Design a protein around this ligand. Structure first.
Ligand SMILES: CC1(C)S[C@H]([C@H](NC(=O)[C@H](N)c2ccccc2)C(=O)O)N[C@H]1C(=O)O
Ligand SMILES: [Zn+2]
Ligand SMILES: [Zn+2]
Length: 243
């Protein structure tokens, strides 16, 4: 198959597997990155990344693809490659790159979770809410009763940044943590779309993510390949410029 060469988002490199319209990359024996692409007319493709985690006899998903059809392709890939049921998905804020495929998850009977605030914003953002709401303590950690049977997914709300509702997820038992759209890579020159951002609190929120997962060495994010912790520090330094 031909390589997909997005205008925004990482390129395909060694270890990147094309499946239909999407790309998959194994990050750890039990963790894979899913990548889907939105074609913007006149601009080209924008890649967005999420995660797939095997936890024993079940699979957990972080973020949908941009669309329902792409998200059904993620479920197809899981069926072919892993052949275990998806127990739940957690989506990391109410924008299209992270929640555009909710209906595909629901059609498949998968339990969906998002920040309560994401669910409240979804109908205002042209999204369908997740079926369950996560809530958070004053220090950002998820209230465990709201995240039942999450296995290795450790959900952390770092504060407002890219959006007010953005959440992040550490993968316990690995050195991986997922920043979603809050974190950009260590070579990025921009924080991306700031239209819904909290420019005052962004730098502290980025740093809070790093402090929540202080031994995560592989930082996964929505629009770049997995990076070092310099993604966190560089994002925070860019965000310092917003104040
Ligand atoms: C990659 C993006 C610049 S766009 C994406 C998101 N936007 C969407 O999901 C929009 N529905 C969209 C509109 C036009 C073109 C592409 C995406 C956002 O506003 O954070 N996340 C941004 C980001 O992570 O900075
Ligand atoms: Zn967003
Ligand atoms: Zn994004």
């Amino acid at each position: 198959s031909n390589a997909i060469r997005p205008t925004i988002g990482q390129q395909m490199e060694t270890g990147d597997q094309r499946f239909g319209d999407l790309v998959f990359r194994q990050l750890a024996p039990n963790v894979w990155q899913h990548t889907s692409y939105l074609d913007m007319p006149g601009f080209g493709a924008v890649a967005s990344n999420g995660l797939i985690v095997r936890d024993g006899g079940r699979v957990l998903v972080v973020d949908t693809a941009w669309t329902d059809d792409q998200t059904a392709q993620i479920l197809n890939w899981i069926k072919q490659e892993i052949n275990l049921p998806v127990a739940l998905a957690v989506v990391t804020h109410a924008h299209q790159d992270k929640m555009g495929g909710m209906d595909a998850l629901h059609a498949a009977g998968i339990a969906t979770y998002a920040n309560a605030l994401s669910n409240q914003l979804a109908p205002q953002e042209g999204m369908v809410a997740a079926q369950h709401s996560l809530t958070f303590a004053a220090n950002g950690w998820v209230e465990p009763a709201t995240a039942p049977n999450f296995g290795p997914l450790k959900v952390f709300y770092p504060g407002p940044g890219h959006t007010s509702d953005n959440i992040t997820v550490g993968i316990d038992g690995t050195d991986i943590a997922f920043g979603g759209c809050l974190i950009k890579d260590s070579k990025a020159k921009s924080l991306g779309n700031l239209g819904d951002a909290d420019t005052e609190h962004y730098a502290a929120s980025a740093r809070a993510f790093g402090a929540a997962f202080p031994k995560a060495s592989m930082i996964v994010m929505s629009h770049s390949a997995p990076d070092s912790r310099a993604a966190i520090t560089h994002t925070a330094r860019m965000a310092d410029k917003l104040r």
